[PDB]
Amino acid sequence: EAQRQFARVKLPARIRYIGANREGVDARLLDLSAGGFAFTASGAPIQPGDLYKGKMLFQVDSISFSLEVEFQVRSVDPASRRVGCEFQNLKPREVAALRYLITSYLAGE
Amino acid sequence: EAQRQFARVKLPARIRYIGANREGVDARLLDLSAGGFAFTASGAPIQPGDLYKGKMLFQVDSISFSLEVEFQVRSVDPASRRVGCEFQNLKPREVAALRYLITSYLAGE
């Protein structure tokens, strides 16, 4: 097994992006980390390697955070339709902020 | 002069609350800190000591943050209509998160 570079957490979170068939997607996140996220595809075709841009929202410490993110699909389980994604081109302070907030959430667990 | 307990910054930020005359307010923030904020009243009556609840939005490191805050008016300059406010009842992790983000903004300056 591989070490995950960023700890993952399950919290209230959502991704909104425009997908392949020009069909807007609104998906609850299965989990989130400073490196990426997962969600259940339940819809249009999606492939490993696909690049999307969207607005991600999540809540930590009663604060709602949202940012525009680009992501790359890293895996698609054709069975469960679980889609694993990696953020692309996040700025240093942005990644740092994500890490801080997720760590703060973890601290609460 | 008095030392400010929390550093203040000028960033894109907004407060939305329901004011005295039941008149909804949407005001850009003059500045923000982990302790409170200021805005120009330009409208209905408002007094030192007034308590309001609203949704505050601000942007740091390309991330948009919003939270429901209760605030107490600490000062009202009847001339410039500058209103200075103090957050009430923020949770420890919430204050810590605010301090972190504002410090991160300051670091960028």
Ligand SMILES: Nc1nc2c(ncn2[C@@H]2O[C@@H]3COP(=O)(O)O[C@H]4[C@@H](O)[C@H](n5cnc6c(=O)[nH]c(N)nc65)O[C@@H]4COP(=O)(O)O[C@H]3[C@H]2O)c(=O)[nH]1
């Ligand atoms: N390609 C890919 N798929 C991912 C990734 N994260 C989650 N998944 C998929 O999501 C399933 C379940 O993830 P899990 O709940 O965290 O639960 C996982 C996890 O807790 C653990 N696990 C398995 N392999 C690894 C690993 O290489 N590293 C770590 N840290 N945990 C693993 O075993 C459970 C299931 O393993 P899987 O059969 O692989 O089944 C995984 C896998 O199909 C990922 O970064 N890349």
Ligand SMILES: Nc1nc2c(ncn2[C@@H]2O[C@@H]3COP(=O)(O)O[C@H]4[C@@H](O)[C@H](n5cnc6c(=O)[nH]c(N)nc65)O[C@@H]4COP(=O)(O)O[C@H]3[C@H]2O)c(=O)[nH]1
């Ligand atoms: N929150 C979240 N982020 C995701 C997910 N899928 C991909 N990412 C993000 O994209 C990076 C690369 O994913 P990977 O190519 O599948 O490459 C993964 C994968 O090969 C493996 N891995 C980690 N966990 C599992 C697992 O539960 N099952 C399996 N089969 N592999 C895993 O370890 C590699 C690196 O893991 P990371 O360091 O965490 O790095 C991940 C992670 O930052 C996801 O389901 N949830």
Ligand SMILES: Nc1nc2c(ncn2[C@@H]2O[C@@H]3COP(=O)(O)O[C@H]4[C@@H](O)[C@H](n5cnc6c(=O)[nH]c(N)nc65)O[C@@H]4COP(=O)(O)O[C@H]3[C@H]2O)c(=O)[nH]1
């Ligand atoms: N009651 C109250 N009013 C506030 C507060 N913060 C800002 N104001 C009001 O906003 C005006 C300008 O604030 P400033 O731009 O930061 O610019 C300020 C600030 O840079 C500085 N200053 C004056 N007094 C103090 C002080 O006691 N502590 C600090 N740290 N700075 C002060 O002088 C400028 C103007 O002084 P002011 O005449 O008082 O005029 C102040 C004052 O009327 C506050 O925490 N409480």
Ligand SMILES: Nc1nc2c(ncn2[C@@H]2O[C@@H]3COP(=O)(O)O[C@H]4[C@@H](O)[C@H](n5cnc6c(=O)[nH]c(N)nc65)O[C@@H]4COP(=O)(O)O[C@H]3[C@H]2O)c(=O)[nH]1
């Ligand atoms: N971002 C922001 N927060 C505000 C403002 N007004 C009040 N607050 C928040 O509410 C606390 C108390 O404000 P104060 O009663 O006016 O009590 C103030 C006030 O008496 C004085 N003070 C600070 N700056 C100034 C200033 O520029 N001018 C004057 N006249 N007094 C100041 O120092 C006391 C404590 O300052 P703080 O520690 O900063 O603590 C402030 C601050 O956390 C504001 O305009 N902007």
